[PDB]
Nucleic acid binder design. Sequence first.
DNA 1: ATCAGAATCCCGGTGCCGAGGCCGCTCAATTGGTCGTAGACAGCTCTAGCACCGCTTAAACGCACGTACGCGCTGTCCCCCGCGTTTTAACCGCCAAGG
DNA 2: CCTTGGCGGTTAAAACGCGGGGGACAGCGCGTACGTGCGTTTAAGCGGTGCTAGAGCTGTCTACGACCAATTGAGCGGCCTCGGCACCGGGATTCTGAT
Lengths: 78, 80, 105, 103, 97, 97, 93, 95
Amino acid sequence: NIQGITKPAIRRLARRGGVKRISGLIYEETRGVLKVFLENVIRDAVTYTEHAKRKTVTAMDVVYALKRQGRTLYGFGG
Amino acid sequence: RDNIQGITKPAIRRLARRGGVKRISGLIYEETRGVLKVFLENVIRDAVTYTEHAKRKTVTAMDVVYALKRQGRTLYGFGG
Amino acid sequence: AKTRSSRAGLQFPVGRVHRLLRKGNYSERVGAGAPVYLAAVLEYLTAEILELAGNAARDNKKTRIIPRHLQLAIRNDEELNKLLGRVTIAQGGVLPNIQAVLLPK
Amino acid sequence: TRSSRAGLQFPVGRVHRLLRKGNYSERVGAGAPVYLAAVLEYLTAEILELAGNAARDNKKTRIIPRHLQLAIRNDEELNKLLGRVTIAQGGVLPNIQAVLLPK
Amino acid sequence: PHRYRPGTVALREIRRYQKSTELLIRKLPFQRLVREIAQDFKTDLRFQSAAIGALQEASEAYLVGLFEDTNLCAIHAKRVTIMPKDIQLARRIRGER
Amino acid sequence: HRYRPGTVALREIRRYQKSTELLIRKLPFQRLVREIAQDFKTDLRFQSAAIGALQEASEAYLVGLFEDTNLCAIHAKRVTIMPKDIQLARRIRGERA
Amino acid sequence: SRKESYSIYVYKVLKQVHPDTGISSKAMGIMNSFVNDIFERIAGEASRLAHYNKRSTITSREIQTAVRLLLPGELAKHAVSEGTKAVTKYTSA
Amino acid sequence: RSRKESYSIYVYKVLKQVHPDTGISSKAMGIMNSFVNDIFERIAGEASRLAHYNKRSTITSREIQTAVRLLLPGELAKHAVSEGTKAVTKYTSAK
DNA sequence: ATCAGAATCCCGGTGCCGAGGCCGCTCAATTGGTCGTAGACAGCTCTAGCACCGCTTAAACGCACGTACGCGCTGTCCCCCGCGTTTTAACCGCCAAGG
DNA sequence: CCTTGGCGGTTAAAACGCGGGGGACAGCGCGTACGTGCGTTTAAGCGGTGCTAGAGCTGTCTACGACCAATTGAGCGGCCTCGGCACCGGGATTCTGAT
């Protein structure tokens, strides 16, 4: 379910981001922020797909949604 | 000369009070004037480029409006 | 009902919206149903701002609407603020806000 | 082709046709697509030179998107131009705060 | 007639300015600053009054917003006084350079 | 034997700084995407490239968020990051309304 | 010159919004700019959706989905309802 | 089976010109092709806005000049203007 | 300070599969000619951007005085990290509808 | 033809427990710099008064860009070889860890 974003995963992401030591209460807030960001991006993607009356959402629609969010992604048919 | 210093200390104090700053250091004013300077520089650079593209030499309000729109600081009520 | 707005029962001009859409270079052709929808959306948004602006003016016990009241209406409502956080209203001022720590005890 | 005759590489004809297909103007000038092709060529040349230097840093011959990421994030103006855009399989620059290092 | 504890004047002026909707910086120094800072882009430029007004509005809004951000940064460290380091932190988080 | 706290963490910071592989597990992220898109539209077919782009974008977003979080924590004379740091960083970023 | 405005339209909306609430000219101009920006953004989203799906025409569906994309949930739903109602009673009339 | 058009070979030629020996991966090539598409979109949109603001419909090279000067930061814009002006003069010299 | 000891990059040997090079094939770039109008340019108007001067008083500014945070130091507590240990399901790989 | 569903092996990784000292809290001990009021100086603001450069509107003739029809070659689909990084084992410094 929602527990797939594990403690070592968030720890690895924080280590890559330059954080030295992380408190134990960071994980839940990180999960919530990830959930809301995914909700926004995937909502835009599914609306883009539904406008075309399709059922399979493409990475092209995801890239368009990210463009709408101002965080464009390269290398995915942009 | 030094018209950036024309933005006196009480003006920056009033702006901070409008923002809601309770205690102000004595050297905040220099950094505030510098950030004002850089924002003025970028906005007026965009506006002057826009005005020059129109082949006019009068900085109009709509030029600043479009410059801010590019910069993401859109303004209403001044046309556009 | 001769004007397209009158047939559509809309205050905003359907014909003017259609003309702007045609001479705005958005597509090769413009469907006739799009201007009605766009005029209705514009009318509804202007209203939704207007009622809150009127309530803000009423709270300030002022007969007329001032752009300060417009800024108040935009800021207080969460959805309007979400929409127009990137817009600064002329002579709109800021909301009355004081941090709890800054308040004397 | 118009590209070789103008001392450039990118296709002027494809640029002009896609300008038509984008409805960027009712009618499009002749010299504007040539300038657009030249600007695109210069931008790509700078990006590719930076990518080659980054590959030479790692003693590598093939361009990995990590090299592009490092090249974009090291140059100032290009990083400003492409700062809001994230690159897949690129990573971030190596930066550890001077306060986090041990005594 | 008496001097009270420092800070109450700060509260009163913050409340009055927040209730206010005016332009705090004088018009002539700002217009002169605009002329000086635009002389390096194109000389003999003639500045419309509405252009100066829009520039004043935008500048005051940006400075005020930087001021709420700097105040938030200062109170983030259990502090009341604002330091320039708060200003650079606010600009760094904002994504503006 | 035993290593002192904060040293192996720094070594992991070094190692994770050079790698570019996706740090999230694939199938848990696929399940998360399906369970978060189920409420919007029903019986949604997903492309592999779509969820891969989602993974990369979310990873970059979280990396930037953690950078801002560490910056906020260190601005207040602190080494460990607190959730209030994330809250303040997102509020200043403009994502929090 | 002959300059257009949405002044009378906003005035008509205001009369049915509040019969006894006047407005200043500065607020009227701010509202005009607001309407211009909203029209530009919705029409731009519709144009992007049309070009991105290989359609050279802009119809009610594109505007509706653009409104859904732009406005927040409750506001998007209510604006969609208003637009659909207006289009339906225009087609009927 | 439709035909998908890209800029792979042109960028490959540019890279070979600026680097005698440099390999290029498919992922990096796609990233930079999408980047070229993004720059194309940015310049085209800026030129369209500039043309509309002056109430024109013919986008000359001057509109692209001002679009590049507004978009590209400083020295990048100046170098692009110099290279493009030289290329335009080269094109106008011949057919 | 100075010795003990794992970690990991450079070095050498494996190796395999996508990139570079090439070939074949086709529809969009290139060229000539035509015509229609967008605008480049000449030209008049009159608007407002600007320069100057005189009052005129609101606003900034220097300074004395005071105490309210800023910053540091010292103590106390605690809770992620790092170690080892136990479980576990994701990934690889294979294999099939089927929409 | 690309997405989804099922199944089997396994090992790399996720999940658990516990010792511990470094970091997060608090609570003083002062130091001084900013907050505030009081004059004192100043410069912004306002009211005329010209002054004149340049934005704006008007018309006219043009010459370039949207159209047509030939034509041909350079870019995309398809195919084949290699080396350069994916990978695995050794070697020695580079740090920390301990005293």
